[PDB]
């Protein structure tokens, strides 16, 4: 079930120059490449410790794929602001999502991309991979010109083949961290919070990969506040439940823990 | 790896 | 990078004989591919224009295919004339889809 | 007009600074320079997907280009040597990408660098 995906900023700034573009590539939960255009020589260079092998011939690849991704983009940010009618005096958002996943047998099992403009859905590759899909009417004239162009063609390729080729080469570099499975270190707290009522936090902690789910039951029959998961810096993660319950009551209530790295869910009861 | 190629919107 | 080889060289014809010039392109993941022709101390003019999506274009005596899979285009130049003699220059689209990678040249010599 | 280059011929002595001109009235996004050699077919110095918008071509060390407008593509040899002894074509298209790809070069400009 692993997947290997990369998300691309582009940021007009107008008056200071070429718009700020970033990269980042991930194996599953783990960040293993980034490239930043905020730099005197800016480059591709290994995010995660299993990347440092890579020669010289990689990161030049992937540092032109990395500058010609940031000069279209460029132009797809002027393109954009034009479809719009907007002011060539604001600050505008281009973002390029792409990944492809592996099946259980290790097979590609499917791959996407999407765009936005300013944090709307654009334009989407559509589930056969054959052609781009405007989303909103104003995508519409960038349907034509891919479609056109054949744009999808040459997304589909990268996504069935070179992406999955790459995806087991980056999951056999460092297999001992992308492979493992972190189960969560689970405990409840109790946080009076008035006088008739104390919030009940059910932790995870030190997790990978990201994938986990969290609920709040009582005995005999719950509202949960479900904070973002988050990293913990270690390539780890942290996330927690929390529940409102009547103060005295807080042992009726269980939480439920559900992780891959886990044989089984989880079930936790606050003690006092 | 990186595509090649990047959508011309 | 993107590599173009233009097989043969120079080629040398009898005019009325039917003759291939031959493109082959190591990434055949292009957009276009494009044959020029280019007289001597002249610029390139644009012979035919293949669309990684068509398979095939004709212009007079002049047909071009495009096999992306083999990753090679022929033009196919019928019943050769002494005013087809030129320099046949083949172009595709970098990697990055932003400018066109040229191969060496062929240059054809239809004799009289 | 198509696409223009002066000058059509030119002699530099080595370490000489030269702007090879070129423009285009077509309004294309996409401008490029080569050089032509014996054998050695068209060589990509620079190109331009856009105003404002320049990158290195196969071969693009000895020279800078500049494109202020959409019109004018400035070929710069900053110190002229012996090996850019070439014929330099400036093209121009609509689309790379799109059916609309035609190229358009311009008449080329002989160029020859002497001691």
């Known amino acids: 079930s692993h997947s290997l995906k990369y998300f691309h900023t582009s940021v007009s700034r107008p008056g200071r120059g070429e718009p700020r573009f970033i990269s980042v590539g991930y194996v599953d939960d783990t960040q293993f490449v980034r490239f930043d255009n905020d730099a005197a020589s800016p480059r591709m260079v290994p995010r995660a410790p299993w990347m440092e092998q890579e020669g010289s011939e990689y990161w030049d690849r992937e540092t032109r794929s990395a500058r010609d991704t940031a000069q279209i983009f460029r132009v797809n940010l002027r393109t954009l602001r034009g479809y719009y009618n907007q002011s060539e005096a604001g600050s505008h958002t281009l973002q390029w999502m792409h990944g492809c996943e592996l099946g259980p047998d290790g097979r590609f099992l499917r791959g996407y991309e999407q765009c936005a403009y300013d944090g709307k859905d654009y334009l989407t590759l559509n589930e056969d991979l054959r052609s781009w899909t405007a989303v909103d009417t104003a995508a519409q004239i960038s349907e034509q010109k891919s479609n056109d162009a054949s744009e999808a063609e040459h997304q589909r390729a990268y996504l069935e083949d070179t992406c999955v080729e790459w995806l087991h080469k980056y999951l056999e570099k460092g297999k001992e961290t992308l492979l493992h499975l972190e189960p969560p270190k689970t405990h409840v707290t109790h946080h009076p919070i008035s006088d008739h009522e104390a919030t009940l936090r059910c932790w995870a902690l030190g997790f990978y990969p990201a994938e986990i789910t969290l609920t709040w039951q009582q005995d005999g029959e719950q509202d949960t506040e479900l904070v973002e998961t988050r990293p913990a810096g270690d390539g780890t993660f942290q996330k927690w439940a929390a529940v409102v319950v009547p103060s005295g009551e807080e042992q009726r209530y269980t939480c439920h823990v559900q992780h891959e790295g886990l044989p089984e869910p989880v079930t936790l009861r606050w003690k006092p | 790896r990186l595509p090649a190629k990047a959508p011309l919107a | 990078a993107q590599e173009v080889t233009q097989i043969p060289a120079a080629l040398s014809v009898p005019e009325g004989e039917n003759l291939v010039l031959n493109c082959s392109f190591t990434?055949?993941?292009?957009?276009?591919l494009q044959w020029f022709r280019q007289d001597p101390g002249k610029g390139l003019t644009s012979l035919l224009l293949?669309?990684?999506?068509?398979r095939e274009q004709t212009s007079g005596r002049l047909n071009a295919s495009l096999d992306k899979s083999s990753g090679r285009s022929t033009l196919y130049i019928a019943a050769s004339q002494p005013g087809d003699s030129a320099t046949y220059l083949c172009?595709?689209?970098?990697?990055?889809?932003?400018?066109?990678?040229f191969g060496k040249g062929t240059t054809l010599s239809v004799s009289s | 007009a198509g696409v223009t280059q002066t000058p059509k011929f030119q002699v530099l002595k080595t370490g000489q600074s030269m702007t090879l001109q070129c423009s285009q009235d077509?309004?294309?996004?996409?401008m490029s320079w080569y050089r032509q050699d014996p054998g050695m077919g068209l060589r990509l110095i620079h190109y331009?997907?856009?105003?404002?918008?320049?990158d290195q071509g196969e071969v693009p060390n000895g020279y800078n280009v500049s494109r202020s407008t959409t019109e004018d593509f400035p070929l710069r040899l900053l110190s002229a040597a012996p090996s850019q002894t070439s014929v330099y074509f400036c093209?121009?298209?609509?689309?790379?990408?799109?059916?609309?790809?035609?190229?358009?070069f311009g008449p080329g400009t002989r160029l020859t660098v002497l001691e």
């Open positions: 093209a121009s298209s609509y689309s790379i990408r799109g059916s609309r790809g035609e190229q358009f």
């Open positions: 990434d055949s993941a292009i957009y276009n």
């Open positions: 293949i669309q990684s999506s068509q």
């Open positions: 172009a595709v689209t970098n990697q990055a889809g932003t400018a066109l990678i």
């Open positions: 077509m309004n294309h996004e996409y």
């Open positions: 331009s997907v856009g105003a404002g918008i320049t």
